[PDB]
Amino acid sequence: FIATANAGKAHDADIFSVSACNSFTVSCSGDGYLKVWDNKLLDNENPKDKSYSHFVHKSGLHHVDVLQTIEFELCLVATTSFSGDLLFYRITRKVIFEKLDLLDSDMKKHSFWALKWGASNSHRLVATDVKGTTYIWKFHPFNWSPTLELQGTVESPMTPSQFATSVDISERGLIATGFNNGTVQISELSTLRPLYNFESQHSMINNSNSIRSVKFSPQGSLLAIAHDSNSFGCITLYETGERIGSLSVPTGEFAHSSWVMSLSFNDSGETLCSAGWDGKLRFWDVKTKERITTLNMHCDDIEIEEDILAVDEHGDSLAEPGVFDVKFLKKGWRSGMGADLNESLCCVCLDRSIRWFREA
Amino acid sequence: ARDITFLTVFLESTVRIEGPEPNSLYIPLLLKIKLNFKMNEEQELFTKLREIVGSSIRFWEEQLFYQVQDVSTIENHVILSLKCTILTDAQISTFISKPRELHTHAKGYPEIYYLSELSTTVNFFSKEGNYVEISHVIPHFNEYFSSLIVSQLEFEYPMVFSMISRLRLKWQQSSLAPISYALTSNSVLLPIMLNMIAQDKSSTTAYQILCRRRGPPIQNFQIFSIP
Amino acid sequence: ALEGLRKKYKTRQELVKALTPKRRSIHLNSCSNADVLAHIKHFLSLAANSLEQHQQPISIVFQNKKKIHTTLDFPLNGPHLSTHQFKLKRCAILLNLLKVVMEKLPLGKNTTVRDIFYSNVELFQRQANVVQWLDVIRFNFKLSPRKSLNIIPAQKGLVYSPPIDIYDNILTPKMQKQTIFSGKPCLIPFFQDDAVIKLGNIVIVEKEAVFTKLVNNYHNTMLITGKGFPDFLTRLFLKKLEQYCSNLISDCSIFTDADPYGISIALNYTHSNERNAYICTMANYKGIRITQVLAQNNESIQLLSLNQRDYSLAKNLIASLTANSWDIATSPLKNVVIECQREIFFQKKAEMNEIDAGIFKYK
Amino acid sequence: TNKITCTQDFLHQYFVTERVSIQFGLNNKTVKRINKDEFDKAVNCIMSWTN
DNA sequence: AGCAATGTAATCGTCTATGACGCGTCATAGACGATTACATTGC
Ligand SMILES: [Mg+2]
């Protein structure tokens, strides 16, 4: 591909996640630092200038989501710090971080792990806790006075009360709640009844088999699911539940040589992004199920020489860094040559670098 | 065979101790509740009253930590056989009797006066006469015994009929020996420390009524229910 | 009897005063060996006099360690009932411990807590009871826990130094000096903090099972260790090493498996909370972390999944470690906090029983 | 003494709650306490009714 | 195995609702939240 702007030593803890809504490249990180990287950057300048940081929590941030709508210019940011809470933020423009706690006080009693916003096409979000419950809210902006009303009481099917790792929302009505050991439950929006809940088929021999991520495909029929086989990562698709194969590198069959950490579907469902801890990215055609290309990740690719982080705190050489997340920026979101017609990609490596990429 | 009769108290709408003559603690046999019935009756009446008598068994067994043996009519009488469970023969021998011989020089010692069956019976009168009406004679029967246990027969016989003394001892009887074994170190404080657990008046349920009452339920105290 | 007595004493006030028997309060609290023994011997005697002669209820009163009035009496003077009132066993345990301490004090030879518990198992039951009541007694007389009342912990941590001379003053009042031998896998019996140690790459191992493989292989690293959670004598030994013979050693490191328990053990080794006497800030943390087992799993470890209790412990260990400290980036507890952060989100522990390789060797 | 005072009568003079008597269960306020001379006259009337 | 950690239950203080007395005020008690002890976990 084409290696566009990046930023090394962005944060200092671990930068765990990234999200984007055209204007922004919001990315929570380790030591509770939301550092919104304003997306519309010209010339070649690194995005630090547009880096409008704001201290959030001392505990630590893993996930981050953000929803920009077209009303009024409402745009919220949702983080789920390690201590178990829902930190929301009104992002409005030098942006000001104005915290509106639109939740209640009797609900902050358990640790919510991941969340996903569902746009109105009726804005919703789901944020499952570390007990198993798949909580569902409903947004009501109205005059600034939002109220987030709870409706979801989707209990944990697999026993007992294990780690609800992954979260998703279908375009129409479906919610895939991946668990710590297989059992990616499928539920419905307005009935609160779990539909067909399958398991990872290749579960032979007692070993770790988790669900690192689940992500639906645009129109809402595909159910590509990542998992972890012992010390190897794979990909398993479904239709919204039947097993229809498994992505694998040419050579058991594995997509990567390590854990598949995050996925992403493009605008209309032609490509997949397999973010692996091995140190590279593999792109797959959904219909055909071959790999399109391989994208190596290197620490020296950082444009600023002082921002290169090739040695860890302890003293080894993490030259090939893990990739905690990879996200897609839709048609016309970036600024630059061919930005309107080309889709864009973004990744956050383990060497504390957030790197964007342009379609080519 | 000392005999005590309570003043005749009847509200409507005789303890026998087989001990020598005398500060002394009383204990039950090893005791009977035996009331006669008359209408100034064994026929018909008695047959269900017996069962109503058996209705008290919960209070006798779940509450007071006793154990029944038999309920068999003796002519015109109901036997409510009651053997002690907290203070068995071995326990009485170990506590008050065995250290009663070695340490004769020690004073402040209690004399045992065994308690036998008590029979304070009052024949109530009802307008019906020949036939009998029920479902209010149940509270009528409960009231007398509830009043008798709470008020009089518990401030001077704690060990034989009290509710919150026997339970306290059972809670503290197991650890009663090391305390004496680590204070005067032979055994001598053991025939008295049992006469001090029973000789406190703060443990009576009368005190428990008028206190702050922090723990919400205890001592249901509802006896002789309907069959 | 309340019948015929209620007319003398009226209303709920002062009737509880009448029914409550007067309590002859006895102060266990408020010092050399003779001074310590005098109070203990007087206490038992004056408590026994009330029971034997005056038939007056005793009430053992004392002030325990603050986190303060507390009372244990006989015969449950307490009003109504409190399910907690199954506590005369604790009073008997306290009395028996006082008797045993007073009896074994003049003998002049320290006896272990385990020996005391084994002597009378029926009443003491779990050794935690004896351990807690010993500390209560020590604090109640203002006796310093460092200067033990002739009662010592049973000894835990073993060493594999390839000398380690220990010197001490032995009471009986007299002072005597001794020398204790080492050089093979064994234990250093005891030395007070007033006593000091000498010496003739330290590797801490917390599991003690992986320890007895590295002792066999040995591929001159004096190999001081402990067990799961360190005993008091082990931290005392490490502090004495750093305080008298710090120069000779270099780069001592802990080595714990990457569960929340392992990092908690390393923390309890390295950094303690508000109350601290011996902390051994010397030690460095180079333990086998999450990013030291996954990055080697290509050329193997069983791995595991988080339990509900493990996650709760690791999250609690994140609230504390950084509550007052301003910044994660620069802090003495940066590595532990970031490691626990990774382990919480990776959702997999990494026990160390089979990865044992040349990691222990520095370079 | 052998007066034998009723449980009912005991509460009413002293500190009453009328709620604590529920779990304690001493409450049965139907028979009521009967004074000795009034008891004698009452039982005489009851006996005279029978004829 | 000496020394930890935490979850849970029990107790204690405080707030508020209701009843009683001389429409407002005071007393009482029931319910809620906070604090601590015990043990069931764990190397
Ligand atoms: Mg372990």
Numbering used by the authors:
A (entry chain C): 5 to 75, 79 to 100, 106 to 133, 138 to 158, 168 to 265, 268 to 278, 286 to 394
B (entry chain B): 2 to 14, 33 to 41, 45 to 52, 57 to 66, 72 to 258
C (entry chain A): 2 to 31, 40 to 76, 85 to 179, 181 to 190, 195 to 222, 228 to 246, 251 to 330, 335 to 398
D (entry chain F): 8 to 58
What text does the study give?
DNA double-strand breaks that initiate meiotic recombination are formed by the topoisomerase-relative enzyme Spo11, supported by conserved auxiliary factors. We report cryo-electron microscopy structures at up to 3.3-Å resolution of DNA-bound core complexes of Saccharomyces cerevisiae Spo11 with Rec102, Rec104 and Ski8. The core complex is monomeric (1:1:1:1 stoichiometry) and adopts a V shape with Spo11 at the base contacting the three other subunits. Spo11 is a central hub making extensive protein–protein and protein–DNA contacts.
We leveraged the tight binding to DNA ends to determine a cryo-EM structure of core complexes bound to a 23-bp hairpin DNA with a two-nucleotide 5′ overhang. Spo11 binds tightly to the free end of this substrate and with much lower affinity to the hairpin end. Core complexes were purified after expression in insect cells and incubated with Mg2+ and hairpin DNA. The structure of the protein–DNA complexes was solved at 3.7-Å resolution. The hairpin’s overhang end is anchored in a deep cleft between the Spo11 WH and Toprim domains. The remainder of the duplex makes non-sequence-specific contacts primarily with Spo11 and fewer with Rec102 and Rec104 but not with Ski8. We could trace the base, sugar and 5′-phosphate of the first nucleotide (A2) in the overhang adjacent to the terminal base pair. By contrast, the next overhang base (T1) could not be traced because of weak density. Residue Y135 involved in DNA covalent bond formation is on the opposite side of the DNA end from the Mg2+-coordinating E233, D288 and D290 residues.
